[PDB]
Amino acid sequence: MNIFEMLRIDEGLRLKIYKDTEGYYTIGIGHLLTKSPSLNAAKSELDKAIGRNTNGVITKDEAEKLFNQDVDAAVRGILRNAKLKPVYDSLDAVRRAAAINMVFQMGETGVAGFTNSLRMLQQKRWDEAAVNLAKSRWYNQTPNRAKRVITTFRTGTWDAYK
Numbered sequence: 001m002n003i004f005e006m007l008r009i010d011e012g013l014r015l016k017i018y019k020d021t022e023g024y025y026t027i028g029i030g031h032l033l034t035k036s037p038s039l040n041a042a043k044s045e046l047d048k049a050i051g052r053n054t055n056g057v058i059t060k061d062e063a064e065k066l067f068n069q070d071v072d073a074a075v076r077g078i079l080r081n082a083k084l085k086p087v088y089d090s091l092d093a094v095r096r097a098a099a100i101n102m103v104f105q106m107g108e109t110g111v112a113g114f115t116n117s118l119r120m121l122q123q124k125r126w127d128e129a130a131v132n133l134a135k136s137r138w139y140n141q142t143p144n145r146a147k148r149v150i151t152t153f154r155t156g157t158w159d160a161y162k
């Protein structure tokens, strides 16, 4: 198991523009296109992303290309964040994957409200952090995914993903 396989399980793969859990136009492997409610805006962002007139449809390869950029960008965002980096640096490899999954799903900004969990993770208080992470809109809206990521932080293993 790894970050790529892990997110591939959490996000799925769709080759045609779809609405995500929040109702936002997405494609591929969790690649958000836009928060605007306009399909057209979405198709424009798509064409800009792919570098071609897609007509709302992409190939598996193109999907994988977006995915690779998105993972990388995620990691890099964490490493450039002063609030984040130090926690991330404190973690083992499996838990780092859990950190990346959250940033990928919610952005650096969505993870901004997790201050108290972050501090718990840094101190390696696993069961405690696991309980604090669950008190969130994230957990309530996407409970199955949230539990997998939480178990991961809690255990430092890929059990939730097997």
Ligand SMILES: Cc1ccccc1C
Pocket (backbone or CB within 6 Å): 078, 084, 085, 087, 088, 098, 099, 100, 102, 103, 111, 114, 118, 121
């Ligand atoms: C989002 C994030 C980033 C770095 C460490 C842990 C967490 C939850």
Ligand SMILES: [Cl-]
Pocket (backbone or CB within 6 Å): 049
């Ligand atoms: Cl892009």
Ligand SMILES: [Cl-]
Pocket (backbone or CB within 6 Å): 141, 142, 143, 144, 145, 146
């Ligand atoms: Cl879910």
